[PDB]
Scaffold this active site. Structure first.
Site, PDB file in Angstrom:
ATOM      1  N   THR A   1     -42.642 107.452 -10.590  1.00 26.29           N
ATOM      2  CA  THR A   1     -41.538 108.400 -10.672  1.00 26.29           C
ATOM      3  C   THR A   1     -40.178 107.721 -10.656  1.00 26.29           C
ATOM      4  OG1 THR A   1     -41.261 108.846  -8.330  1.00 26.29           O
ATOM      5  CG2 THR A   1     -42.922 110.161  -9.515  1.00 26.29           C
TER       6      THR A   1
ATOM      7  N   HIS B   1     -42.924 104.684   0.848  1.00 24.59           N
ATOM      8  CA  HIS B   1     -41.522 105.024   0.806  1.00 24.59           C
ATOM      9  C   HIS B   1     -41.431 106.540   0.739  1.00 24.59           C
ATOM     10  CE1 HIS B   1     -42.858 104.933  -3.349  1.00 24.59           C
ATOM     11  NE2 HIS B   1     -42.047 105.973  -3.458  1.00 24.59           N
TER      12      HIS B   1
ATOM     13  N   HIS C   1     -32.775 102.636  -3.860  1.00 25.76           N
ATOM     14  CA  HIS C   1     -33.281 103.950  -4.282  1.00 25.76           C
ATOM     15  C   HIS C   1     -34.095 104.684  -3.219  1.00 25.76           C
ATOM     16  CE1 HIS C   1     -37.071 101.926  -5.685  1.00 25.76           C
ATOM     17  NE2 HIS C   1     -36.207 101.013  -6.095  1.00 25.76           N
TER      18      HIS C   1
ATOM     19  N   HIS D   1     -38.951 110.162  -0.634  1.00 25.17           N
ATOM     20  CA  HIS D   1     -37.924 110.831  -1.429  1.00 25.17           C
ATOM     21  C   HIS D   1     -37.470 112.044  -0.610  1.00 25.17           C
ATOM     22  CE1 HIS D   1     -39.271 108.566  -5.051  1.00 25.17           C
ATOM     23  NE2 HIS D   1     -40.424 108.645  -4.422  1.00 25.17           N
TER      24      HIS D   1
ATOM     25  N   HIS E   1     -44.827 108.703  -0.275  1.00 23.69           N
ATOM     26  CA  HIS E   1     -45.671 108.082  -1.261  1.00 23.69           C
ATOM     27  C   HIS E   1     -46.256 106.807  -0.673  1.00 23.69           C
ATOM     28  CE1 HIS E   1     -43.407 110.179  -4.742  1.00 23.69           C
ATOM     29  NE2 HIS E   1     -44.297 110.942  -4.155  1.00 23.69           N
TER      30      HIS E   1
ATOM     31  N   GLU F   1     -40.646 115.566  -4.832  1.00 21.35           N
ATOM     32  CA  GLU F   1     -40.814 115.302  -6.261  1.00 21.35           C
ATOM     33  C   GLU F   1     -41.835 116.260  -6.846  1.00 21.35           C
ATOM     34  OE1 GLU F   1     -41.140 110.889  -6.727  1.00 21.35           O
ATOM     35  OE2 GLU F   1     -39.019 111.226  -7.207  1.00 21.35           O
TER      36      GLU F   1
HETATM   37  C1  LIG Z   1     -44.087  94.670  -5.246  1.00 26.76           C
HETATM   38  C2  LIG Z   1     -44.437  94.046  -6.456  1.00 26.76           C
HETATM   39  C3  LIG Z   1     -45.175  92.861  -6.439  1.00 26.76           C
HETATM   40  C4  LIG Z   1     -45.507  92.275  -7.670  1.00 26.76           C
HETATM   41  C5  LIG Z   1     -45.117  92.856  -8.895  1.00 26.76           C
HETATM   42  C6  LIG Z   1     -44.373  94.054  -8.865  1.00 26.76           C
HETATM   43  C7  LIG Z   1     -43.935  94.675  -9.992  1.00 26.76           C
HETATM   44  N1  LIG Z   1     -43.488  93.956 -11.007  1.00 26.76           N
HETATM   45  N2  LIG Z   1     -43.095  94.762 -11.980  1.00 26.76           N
HETATM   46  C8  LIG Z   1     -43.280  96.045 -11.572  1.00 26.76           C
HETATM   47  C9  LIG Z   1     -43.807  96.004 -10.319  1.00 26.76           C
HETATM   48  C10 LIG Z   1     -44.156  97.109  -9.554  1.00 26.76           C
HETATM   49  C11 LIG Z   1     -45.332  97.121  -8.797  1.00 26.76           C
HETATM   50  C12 LIG Z   1     -45.716  98.214  -8.015  1.00 26.76           C
HETATM   51  N3  LIG Z   1     -44.927  99.354  -7.958  1.00 26.76           N
HETATM   52  C13 LIG Z   1     -43.793  99.410  -8.668  1.00 26.76           C
HETATM   53  N4  LIG Z   1     -42.976 100.513  -8.623  1.00 26.76           N
HETATM   54  C14 LIG Z   1     -43.258 101.770  -8.140  1.00 26.76           C
HETATM   55  C15 LIG Z   1     -44.276 102.169  -7.261  1.00 26.76           C
HETATM   56  C16 LIG Z   1     -44.438 103.498  -6.869  1.00 26.76           C
HETATM   57  C17 LIG Z   1     -43.576 104.475  -7.381  1.00 26.76           C
HETATM   58  S1  LIG Z   1     -43.757 106.219  -7.008  1.00 26.76           S
HETATM   59  N5  LIG Z   1     -42.257 106.812  -6.685  1.00 26.76           N
HETATM   60  O1  LIG Z   1     -44.273 106.885  -8.224  1.00 26.76           O
HETATM   61  O2  LIG Z   1     -44.682 106.257  -5.804  1.00 26.76           O
HETATM   62  C18 LIG Z   1     -42.593 104.090  -8.285  1.00 26.76           C
HETATM   63  C19 LIG Z   1     -42.407 102.765  -8.650  1.00 26.76           C
HETATM   64  C20 LIG Z   1     -43.390  98.290  -9.466  1.00 26.76           C
HETATM   65  C21 LIG Z   1     -42.843  96.923 -12.617  1.00 26.76           C
HETATM   66  C22 LIG Z   1     -42.572  96.044 -13.903  1.00 26.76           C
HETATM   67  C23 LIG Z   1     -43.745  96.165 -14.911  1.00 26.76           C
HETATM   68  C24 LIG Z   1     -41.221  96.393 -14.613  1.00 26.76           C
HETATM   69  C25 LIG Z   1     -42.501  94.633 -13.297  1.00 26.76           C
HETATM   70  N6  LIG Z   1     -44.063  94.576  -7.657  1.00 26.76           N
HETATM   71 ZN   LIG Z   2     -42.137 107.563  -4.802  1.00 24.72          ZN
END
Ligand SMILES: Cc1cccc(-c2nn3c(c2-c2ccnc(Nc4ccc(S(N)(=O)=O)cc4)c2)CC(C)(C)C3)n1
Ligand SMILES: [Zn+2]
EC number: 4.2.1.1
Length: 257
Positions: free
Chosen positions: A195, A91, A61, A93, A116, A103
């Site tokens: 987002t 990252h 993505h 967009h 972001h 966005e």
């Molecule tokens: C890297 C990492 C390490 C440990 C855990 C996670 C993680 N696990 N899970 C998630 C996440 C998670 C954690 C942090 N950022 C995201 N996603 C994210 C971040 C920023 C943007 S933006 N476009 O608005 O800047 C959009 C999506 C997802 C989501 C979930 C609850 C389904 C499960 N991720």
């Molecule tokens: Zn983003």
């Protein structure tokens, strides 16, 4: 399964993620005339001198640069925030042409791209726990316009040919994200969401007023990336932006007069 096209794009996301129609979704249009100056907001503290970048990767993505977040190194504090938020990743967009890709929008103006820088609140211990809290993440949003080259971006641009397809990654050590920041830290702030799926309502948004300029050659390299994995039909990674969502019962506050 989700993506940005006709059959799996943003207007479909609510079926798997019903919070897509929630009360604090992002991005939003920033109406500059309605955003009120809030003299109680602090200057932002962006402390990136000790940042430790690790990898760059194509996740199907966007592309993202990841950081070591196992101690307070690169941190965001102040502004609207209580406490300390650690930088985890950044990252982008972007669009298929220069008139779209951001966005957030500003008086309905779309920029060519949006950066972001994603940070999480250390009081929750890990980022997974943070995404479950209304104040778990702070995302610093920076607009890109096309003009002069951004020297601090070139190291990123030059490795993108090595992560063309989903699943690919590379070592990306010693990258300094200070080189992506504009002069002014004047900002707008509002409570919102991720987002991309899962669209969690866990983000304090901090969107900088001053865009950075990147060159047409730099953004062209973003547009050569692929959404697909190696071996699938080639589909350019372009227009990976969610449109502005309804503001509902929120106020956007300005740090500046
Ligand atoms: C890297 C990492 C390490 C440990 C855990 C996670 C993680 N696990 N899970 C998630 C996440 C998670 C954690 C942090 N950022 C995201 N996603 C994210 C971040 C920023 C943007 S933006 N476009 O608005 O800047 C959009 C999506 C997802 C989501 C979930 C609850 C389904 C499960 N991720
Ligand atoms: Zn983003």
């Amino acid at each position: 399964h989700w993506g940005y096209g006709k059959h799996n794009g943003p207007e479909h996301w609510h079926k798997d993620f019903p919070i897509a129609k929630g009360e604090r979704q992002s991005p939003v249009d920033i109406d500059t005339h309605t955003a009120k100056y809030d003299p109680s907001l602090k200057p932002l503290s962006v402390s990136y001198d000790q940042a430790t970048s690790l990898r760059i990767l194509n996740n199907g993505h966007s592309f993202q640069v990841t950081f070591d977040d196992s101690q307070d190194k690169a941190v965001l504090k102040g502004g609207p925030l209580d406490g300390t938020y650690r930088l985890l990743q950044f990252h982008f967009h972007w669009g298929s042409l220069d008139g779209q890709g951001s966005e957030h929008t500003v008086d309905k103006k779309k920029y060519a791209a949006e950066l972001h820088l994603v940070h999480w609140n250390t009081k929750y211990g890990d980022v997974g726990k943070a995404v479950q809290q209304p104040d778990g993440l702070a995302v610093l949003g920076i607009f890109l316009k096309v003009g002069s080259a951004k020297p601090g971006l070139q190291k990123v641009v030059d490795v993108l040919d090595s992560i063309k397809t989903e699943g690919k990654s590379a070592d990306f050590t010693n990258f300094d994200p200070r080189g992506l920041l504009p002069e002014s830290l004047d900002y707008w702030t509002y409570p919102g969401s991720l987002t991309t799926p899962p669209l969690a309502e866990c983000v304090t948004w901090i969107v900088l007023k001053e865009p950075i300029s990147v060159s047409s050659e730099q953004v062209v390299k973003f547009r050569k990336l692929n959404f697909n994995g190696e071996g699938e039909p080639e589909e350019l990674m372009v227009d990976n932006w969610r449109p502005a969502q309804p503001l509902k019962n929120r106020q956007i506050k300005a740090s500046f007069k």
